[PDB]
């Protein structure tokens, strides 16, 4: 099913702020080399897209990629079928995919001068960080090694030179100025929906506590879990006794309230196992996640909340990446998203 | 005006390199912190869009940002109106829009260590370069200085700030491996046309030379002037007797010759000086530049090609800016490019 009708489409950027070097901009001198003598500087904005069918139905979902990511992830898989853009215009919903500031069409801030160094301004690190095609190969769970594939893998084998291209580094920006730039467009759309995935999972969070136009959450394999501040319970350490997962985030107990205010799903793959794997460290670090969010969402649900976590092998969908969204069973998981967003009427205008 | 029927529509990547970091992964041990060792890095890939129409005419169309600018260019303006994108699949063109290896969705070459360092070798350069809003002002010819509009202007004033905000920098890829990544994508697509933008000029220009497939280029406001090795003109310093403008690129005859094959045609907004202007840098700029072109399209023409100069304002289009595909007349802009694939016959199956 490609065909898509859409009565409009487009793209712009909101968010970010400036910055400014010294002096002044003296329009006779030679511009090129750039300097930043005189300079203004966009930085940390974001880019959206937006595609709206014929006679939406329900609310607008914004569909934000994880770590290293772009929108690229929710356009088509790594195969080239349909991704969930193309899909939930089809089930008439209007669908928006950013790029978050520091990731593909969003802003890299950099200037004239070592990365990320505006003068003596370190407005992000020269020193970058970044996963190999082996570490997200683990991490993605497509196997327990790289070049090895789990048993009932819903991967697109075949396609890993695809998948892997469409992963990079992100700059140092502030998780706080990401968060921003989502408030801003969350602001502009109305009410809607976040569709997150892994490292935006904490971010989305976040979002709805600032924002309340945000009316549902699901999250795909979330990667940071979150508390009320001082309540975050006793968390094992992983299977080789000195890893930990990734810290919990924080947040004061009157914004993790409105969590319990809207309907959240935390919807995890395959082939996290169910005890310690000293072994194989980002399965035992997914099973200890895993394990973090169930307390993250039974704590959202003790204050009146309608938060809940769907394994996908428990409603019949077996070999899940963490990526559900782009394995070759995607259509499936898309309809139990479909499921999600009817049950609670946000497929209604 | 908005409205848009696909055929089909996703993304893919292509093209780019591998390198590889020291030793061995384990995936025992932590995968985060990242490491290099072990690590295989995905580099310099290109990410392409592409939206079909129903019942397709003539040749798809490859559209090519400019320097430092992504494919957002073709599918808005700044001020949200409809971009090349929308417009020409609903002039029945298959639409190929593509972020270049180093910017936007496309790569950009970092790892674990100092910006473009892996572990002794330099990928790409740490220190940085990249135009001010004020630089990019005066060489977009929004008007002669920063905040200061030419009265006839068609930039969709108001949308300043969006506009700068989809401008950034690119890291130090070698322009071979830019044009690399669009030959494997136009020998992917079959015979197309390539639609470039400023700094994408002279490196659609060298495509061609290496690929039969591309039928026809039109280019807005190209930034480097190409010629034979060895039979540069002679181009005069800029009015403040110190500066010049890019140095001419040069390529052997053999592929120079091939670009008299197709139609070829540059094209330019208003606003650029007849005489010299020491007083504003980049109009002065704009003036030589345009002159160099003239040759390198007379050039192409003594070698029996067809390669022509379209001012914008000898069409009756007045104050269009360098990027005339975004400014508020953009729909009369579109017209001549139609006009041009009609009259070459590259709107015909
Ligand atoms: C898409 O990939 C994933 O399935 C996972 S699993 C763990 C991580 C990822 S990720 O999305 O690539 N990046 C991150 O989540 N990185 C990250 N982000 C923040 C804000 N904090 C910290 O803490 C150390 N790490
Ligand atoms: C989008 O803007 C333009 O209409 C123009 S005019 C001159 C350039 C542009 S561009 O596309 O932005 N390129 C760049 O600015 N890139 C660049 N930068 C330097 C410092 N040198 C070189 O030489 C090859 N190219």
Redo the contacts between chains.
């Keep these: 099913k490609?065909?898509?009708?859409?009565?409009?489409?487009?793209?712009?950027?909101i968010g970010?702020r400036?910055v400014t070097?010294p002096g002044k901009?003296d329009?006779?001198?030679?511009?090129?080399?750039?300097?930043?003598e005189?300079?203004?500087?966009?930085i940390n904005?974001m880019?959206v897209?937006f595609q709206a069918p014929?006679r939406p139905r329900g609310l607008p979902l914004v569909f934000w990629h994880g770590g290293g990511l772009?929108?690229?992830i929710w356009?088509?898989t790594p195969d080239?079928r349909?991704?969930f853009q193309?899909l939930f215009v089809q089930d008439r919903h209007t669908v928006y995919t950013i790029?978050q500031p520091g990731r593909?069409?969003g802003?890299?801030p950099?200037?004239?001068?070592?990365?990320?160094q505006l003068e003596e301004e370190s407005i992000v690190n020269?020193?970058?960080?970044?996963?190999?095609?082996?570490?997200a190969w683990?991490?993605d769970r497509l196997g327990?090694?790289?070049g090895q594939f789990f048993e009932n893998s819903q991967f697109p084998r075949g396609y890993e030179?695809?998948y892997?291209?469409?992963?990079?580094?992100s700059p140092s920006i502030s998780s706080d100025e990401i968060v921003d730039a989502v408030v801003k467009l969350v602001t502009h759309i109305g009410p809607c929906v976040l569709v997150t995935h892994a490292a935006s999972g904490v971010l989305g969070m976040r979002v709805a506590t600032h924002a309340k136009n945000v009316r549902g959450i699901v999250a795909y394999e979330p990667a940071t879990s979150i508390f009320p501040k001082g309540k975050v319970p006793e968390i094992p350490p992983l299977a080789?006794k000195k890893?930990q997962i990734f810290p919990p985030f924080e947040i004061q107990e009157s914004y993790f309230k409105k969590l319990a205010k809207i309907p959240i799903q935390f919807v995890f793959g395959d082939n996290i196992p169910k005890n310690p794997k000293?072994?194989?460290?980002?399965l035992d670090?997914w099973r200890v996640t895993r394990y973090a969010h169930s307390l993250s969402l039974e704590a959202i649900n003790k204050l009146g909340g309608q938060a809940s976590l769907l394994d996908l092998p428990t409603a019949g969908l077996r070999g899940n990446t963490a990526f559900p969204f782009t394995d070759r069973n995607n259509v499936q998981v898309a309809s139990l998203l479909s499921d999600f967003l009817g049950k609670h009427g946000l497929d209604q205008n």
């Design positions: 490609r065909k898509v009708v859409l009565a409009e489409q487009g793209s712009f950027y970010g400036t070097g901009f329009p006779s001198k030679p511009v090129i080399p750039y300097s930043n005189g300079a203004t500087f966009y904005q880019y897209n014929v772009t929108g690229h356009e088509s080239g349909p991704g193309t790029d593909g069409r802003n890299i950099t200037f004239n001068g070592p990365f990320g020269t020193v970058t960080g970044n996963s190999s095609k082996e570490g683990v991490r327990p090694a790289p030179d695809n892997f291209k469409e992963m990079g580094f080789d890893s000293s072994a194989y460290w980002f670090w």
